[PDB]
Design a protein around this nucleic acid. Structure first.
Ligand code: MG
Ligand code: MG
Ligand code: MG
Ligand code: MG
Ligand code: MG
Ligand code: MG
Ligand code: MG
Ligand code: MG
Ligand code: MG
Ligand code: MG
Ligand code: MG
Ligand code: MG
Ligand code: MG
Ligand code: MG
Ligand code: MG
Ligand code: MG
Ligand code: MG
Lengths: 107, 131, 394, 63
RNA sequence: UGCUUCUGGGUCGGGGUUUCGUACGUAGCAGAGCAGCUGCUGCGAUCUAUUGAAAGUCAGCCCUCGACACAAGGGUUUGU
RNA sequence: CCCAUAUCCGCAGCAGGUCUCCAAGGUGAACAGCCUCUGGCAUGUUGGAACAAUGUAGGUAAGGGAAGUCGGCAAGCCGGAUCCGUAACUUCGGGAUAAGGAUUGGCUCUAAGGGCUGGCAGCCGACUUAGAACUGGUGCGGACCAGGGGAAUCCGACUGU
């Protein structure tokens, strides 16, 4: 179970509450990366570019309130890396955030 | 016997209020307030029921260029009562009186605050309505 | 030369230094003077600031403008679940002042109280009092305890109990209990110790310490506000807008001589989080906590003789930033120090209360339980649902 | 203490809530909050504001 | 202040509360009129119903015990 | 080759100075301001975390309204356009946007204002103006742009330096 995938909703709204306009989206990324490390316990967190695009899709200050993400913990193929597992964060387009839970995804 | 309670003061010195009687004066310009000891840099302030010293800026010539005793009957600044009600009026008004507290005129236009009416029976008798 | 116009100085030099309180829990500096002719009783209590509301009552003040008239008065709700007496501490009068003489502790102490003895409960083995407790369990140790009690009867002049709070009944994150000494006033010293010894490990409700319409003192730490300038800390006049180098200042901090800044001049620093003792806060109501009776939750502790609605003291949505008050509470007129969740020390009056305002009897006609999270306009959810009718959620 | 009704929104005002307005023509109004007060003072008709009691009655929403 | 009593906090969800004020779409022989075809079909700000709707709401709001994982750890010191 | 918030002069990759040519769409009177395309850049000699005082630069404030101060300094008010209206005084040119009012959105229409081919017919067209209905929680020069006014006294005619 080192390799595992789960889906989460991250309440970006309470993560960046009170942040300045020019730091709001840049801090959402830092909060997503911080979220991923906490859940998967993996210092090597790689944010997908599409997830980067979703967070910035409304500019630097009007960041989306909620965002559904998939956390895949994968083995690292670089023998030179000090970390043997890395977490990949991908964007999940959802129409509605109502009633969404944390679910396991099996491939 | 029953003393009035503190209310918010909305009329510092220099406030020009309406004159709500039939004396002839249109407005009253407050130059001081009765009973104010005050402190450094603090303007004397007046609320409903307070006797003040005022001049007439607009009105009959005989009433202008002299100091009258007046009483504030309405104020635009909202003041709390002991029943928790915050009351305010559409305008700031007063009536010219003498040192004894009896009106110089005979009629009052608009309502009169209950705080002033209880304190000045001569003004109360002339009030068309009480708030 | 003399200052041109007279003006009183800003602030009181009697509350100096304006520093951060060394204690988070309010300290009783003076207990009420002991009167050996009264029955044994406690003189203080611990409660937690839940929040503020307002009430309606008819005043009884002959010769007043509000005699036989209803008024709206603000009140503070302080949640005061029963405390547990866990020890007795004796004091001996010496020519250097009171000196602690002997402390005894009950055989059992809950984990809430034991948490007080640790800085890291997680990492601790919870060894506190594990060897002291064995003294009550054997004949040799028991024979030493009563000797300690006998010694306290011979020599001590002041007796205090060690009561702590029960944090498992409050809605707060904190689980460590607040433990304080309460002085036992009343009869002889022997009667004090007999009274205290029977109450080890027992619970003491607030109703056994205070009563309705009683004037008490509230001791606590004020809300902290951090580094503040003289304009906010001391309330000095703002300098004109043209001032170069800032106007939220005191322009002259002293004369040439003495060639020093005096202790009586306003300076920047800590504002708030000060220890304070406030007196003459009347008790408007000693409310009962929730009870399950015949399978029904009885919680209408906010009902009055004139309002029979089955509602608790909690406003709609609960007490903002506090939680839900499901324990006994004391309704204090006006405001008290501290934030929400702050632990307040309740103390009996050091004065003789002979004044109409001190002796007036409070009869609440109404207690406002509207939501404080906004401009709430409904007293109860039943009242709201009846006004609105069915909604899309239904 | 009797409960007033907001002159604009028709909601009822419990003691120690809202404000009272006395106009120079002798009419006296009670307002639940500054939102109801602001609408009344800007001469908005309550029968067109969806959340008032006069609107819902006119449009039979409760009925 | 918190960091295993099948317990703890945390995240998400749900509910309460509260703010604004009635969402998109769909329907309407409601709409000042105008255009084309012999009453119908188009364009049309707005109006009505769905719809006190939609949206937000602790980040320092209140209650959950639904879902998810995590939590029995690490470092430096200290002795009459 | 640079031709200038880094190739020049100011001791320097210095917010200063230093002569020119070309010059898109929208709004608008407009080379105004605001947004965009072509072309260009990486925030101006560093970053991270906090969000105390005191600052610098922006705002908002109940009731009063210059009581502040040497002094209304500062800020604030006014502001576009259309229609109406406009005094003292005057060197008859002005004063004058004197002062003072009203109006302004969206949508659906009505009328008027032309060219070419052969008092008429057909075919083409360019933005304008005026009027009317309807319509929104009276909001409409909705951002941007954008005069506060009046009564006087002294001095110097004015524009210019
Ligand atoms: Mg002064
Ligand atoms: Mg002196
Ligand atoms: Mg200067
Ligand atoms: Mg509140
Ligand atoms: Mg910058
Ligand atoms: Mg940079
Ligand atoms: Mg540079
Ligand atoms: Mg720089
Ligand atoms: Mg103001
Ligand atoms: Mg105002
Ligand atoms: Mg002056
Ligand atoms: Mg002065
Ligand atoms: Mg100026
Ligand atoms: Mg002029
Ligand atoms: Mg002259
Ligand atoms: Mg000149
Ligand atoms: Mg020259």
């Amino acid at each position: 179970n080192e390799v595992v995938t789960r889906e989460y909703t991250i309440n970006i709204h309470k993560r960046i509450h009170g942040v300045g306009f020019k730091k709001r989206a840049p801090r959402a990324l830092k909060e997503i990366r911080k979220f991923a490390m906490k859940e998967m316990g993996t210092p090597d967190v790689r944010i997908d570019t599409r997830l980067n695009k979703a967070v910035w899709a409304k500019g630097i200050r009007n960041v989306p309130y909620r965002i559904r993400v998939r956390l895949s913990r994968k083995r690292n193929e670089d023998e030179d890396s000090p970390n043997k597992l890395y977490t990949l964060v991908t964007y999940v387009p959802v129409t509605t955030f109502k009633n969404l839970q944390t679910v396991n995804v099996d491939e | 016997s029953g003393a009035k309670f503190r209310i918010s003061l909305g009329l510092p010195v220099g406030a020009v209020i309406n004159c709500a009687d039939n004396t002839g004066a249109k407005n009253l310009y407050i130059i001081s307030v009765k009973g104010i000891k005050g402190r450094l840099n603090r303007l004397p302030a007046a609320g409903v029921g307070d006797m003040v010293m005022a001049t007439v800026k607009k009105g009959k010539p005989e009433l202008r260029k002299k100091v009258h005793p007046a009483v504030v009957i309405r104020q635009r600044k909202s003041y709390r009562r002991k029943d928790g009600v915050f009351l305010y009026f559409e305008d700031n008004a007063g009536v010219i009186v003498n040192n004894k507290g009896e009106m110089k005129g005979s009629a009052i236009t608009g309502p009169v605050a209950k705080e002033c009416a209880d304190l000045w029976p001569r003004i109360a008798s002339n009030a068309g309505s009480i708030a | 030369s003399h200052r041109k116009f007279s003006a009183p100085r800003h602030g009181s030099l009697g509350f100096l230094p304006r520093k951060r309180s060394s204690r988070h829990r309010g300290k009783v500096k003076s207990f009420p003077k002991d009167d050996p002719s009264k029955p044994v009783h406690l003189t203080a209590f611990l409660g937690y600031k839940a929040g503020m509301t307002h009430i309606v009552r008819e005043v009884d003040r002959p010769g007043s403008k509000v005699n036989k008239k209803e008024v709206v008065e603000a009140v503070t709700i302080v949640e005061t679940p029963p405390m547990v007496v866990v020890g007795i501490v004796g004091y001996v009068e010496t020519p250097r002042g009171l000196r602690t003489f002997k402390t005894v502790f009950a055989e059992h102490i809950s984990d809430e109280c034991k948490r007080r003895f640790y800085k890291n409960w997680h990492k601790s083995k919870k060894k506190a009092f594990t060897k002291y407790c064995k003294k009550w369990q054997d004949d040799a140790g028991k024979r030493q305890l009563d000797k300690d009690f006998s010694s306290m009867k011979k020599y001590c002049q002041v007796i205090r109990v060690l009561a702590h709070t029960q944090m498992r009944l409050l809605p707060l994150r904190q689980k460590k209990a607040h433990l304080m000494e309460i002085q036992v006033n009343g009869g002889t010293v022997a009667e004090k110790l007999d009274w205290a010894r029977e109450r080890l490990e027992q619970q003491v409700p607030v109703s056994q310490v205070f009563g309705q319409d009683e004037m008490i003192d509230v001791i606590g730490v004020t809300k902290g506000k951090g580094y503040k300038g003289v304009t906010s800390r001391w309330h000095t006049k703002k300098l004109p807008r043209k001032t170069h180098r800032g106007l939220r200042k005191v322009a002259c901090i002293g004369a040439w001589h003495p060639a020093r800044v005096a202790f009586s001049v306003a300076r920047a620093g800590q504002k708030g989080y000060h220890h304070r003792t406030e007196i003459n806060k009347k008790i408007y109501k000693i409310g009962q906590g929730y009870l399950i009776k015949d399978g029904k939750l009885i919680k209408n502790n906010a009902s009055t003789d004139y309002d029979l609605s089955d509602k608790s003291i909690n406003p709609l949505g609960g007490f903002v930033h506090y939680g839900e008050v499901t324990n006994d509470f004391v309704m204090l007129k006006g405001c008290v120090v501290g934030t929400k969740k702050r632990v307040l020390t309740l103390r009996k009056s050091l004065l003789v209360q002979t004044k109409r305002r001190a002796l007036e009897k409070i009869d609440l006609k109404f207690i406002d339980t509207t939501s404080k999270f906004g401009h709430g306009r409904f007293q109860t959810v039943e009242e709201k649902k009846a006004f609105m009718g069915p909604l899309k959620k239904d | 203490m009797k409960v007033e009704l907001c002159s604009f929104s028709g909601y009822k005002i419990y003691p120690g809530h809202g404000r009272r307005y006395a106009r120079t023509d002798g009419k006296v109004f009670q307002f639940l909050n500054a939102k109801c007060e602001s609408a009344f003072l800007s001469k908005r008709n309550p029968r067109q504001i969806n959340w008032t009691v006069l609107y819902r009655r006119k449009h039979k929403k409760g009925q």
